[PDB]
Amino acid sequence: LANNMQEAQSIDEIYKYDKKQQQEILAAKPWTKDHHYFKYCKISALALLKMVMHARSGGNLAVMGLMLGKVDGETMIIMDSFALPVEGTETRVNAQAAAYEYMAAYIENAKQVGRLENAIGWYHSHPGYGCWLSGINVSTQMLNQQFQEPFVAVVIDPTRTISAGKVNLGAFRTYPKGYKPTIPLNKIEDFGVHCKQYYALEVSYFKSSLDRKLLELLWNKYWVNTLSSSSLLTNADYTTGQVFDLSEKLEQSEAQLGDKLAKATRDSCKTTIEAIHGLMSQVIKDKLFNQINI
Template sequence: MAVSSVHLEADAYLVCITHALSTEREEVMGLLIGEVDEQHVSHVSAVIMLRRSDKRPDRVEISPEQLSDASTKAEMLAKELDRPMRVLGWYHSHPHITVWPSHVDVRTQAMYQMLDPGFIGLIFSVFNEDKITKQNRVQVTCFQSVNYGGDYGPPQYERVEVPLHIVPSAGIGSTALDALVELPRILCLEEGEAYGQTTQDGDLDLLTKIQNASVYTKCLCHIMEVMSGPLIQALENRLKMNKFRMEQLTQRREDLKQQLRSLKTS
């Protein structure tokens, strides 16, 4: 393997999990941004969520245009952070099914590795009930594809697990925060595109048009209820916590100044 292990920063992991939990009906996908060190360790520090043009419950596809746009964003991020950032891999969700990649996932991963041998794949299994505890659990795996078919026979791709480590972070970085705020907009755009396709059919009767508009409105309200509302509340709670922390640090600074003045006078 071209990658020895993967270090995923906690705030990037939060973005991936939030995106995966945004829907339990179809798979979601995105791209991983970061850098590779001399020990062939991939450090993932940013995530780019991708808008799905075709929502399917069991498959996701990344277009060449999306890869090109992601590479451009990685270059912009590299200039902003003054670090050699690039696209390191992709991630997608498995709602209600196992975390292990399907044969389609393994072939897709192999195709990406033809372009970049260090390309990695992450899969997040969500809304999958544990048979013993009867509770939903979240699982994640990191993998690459290896061809065991040899150089002369037909390709026989199999998954190979890559060690994954979640690296703690002091807080949510600006890149991760921008991605979280972007998520409701992406979901609304996807619903808008799906609704726009129904309006292109001029032969629909009035009752069908009203039904389609009602479903579209319901989907938008659902996004506001399960995504926008909790996200705003979480950000407000974090803002409140940060203000409280700032007050503590300010008080601590004043105490240290007072101790310093006491030492000087004594």
């Protein structure tokens, strides 16, 4: 924990809110020009944890809520998530009367304490029903996007997440009216009949310096799973798939050349860095264990 910096780190400016910049970016409205504008959604660790806990706590029923944050450039930042007092069946949720009063009161109370962020989106949980936009979510997301432009639909699946051990969070945004534009068919199948109406987004997560510092001492028995990590063995299929997509991207960039090369180089660097990190861990293990009593 020493021989480094302990003050405001380079992962804390993401948590800083600038009112003037947000006002300028809201007045600019760069989203209306290119409709494929937003492509990245950065969610805080706290927001994701709260969303997953609330979705799982609902049991087999469906739950819904809001999420705060802001928007910068080509990315949407989602910082906090607060639930709603909704009473939904196994398929549909309504949020009839007490949900909106809760929204207004909670936003006002949060602004009282110091929460300077505004509402940035809504989320609703599919209890084992995959991760896609239904014919009602599409309509309500279009309704929200028509007037409150900075918005995003987050879909979470609690049952599948708890059964498979991996979170299933999907960020989506709807195209406006009249916007038309051995390989698996899941690309069309896993979406509803409105597959051409909405498009997904790249979901990433971030955490603060204090978040990582406190989570470093979260538990002191994963060291065994790190020493006997067995890297380059549990994700070989991942690396082969990455190599295949990298070859496809290289072919596309070569066709274009005859700026697309930048993302291909980035993907290649990422895959190679992962492989080199795995080899480094294996070399460290070999030096630690097998180089003793020779």
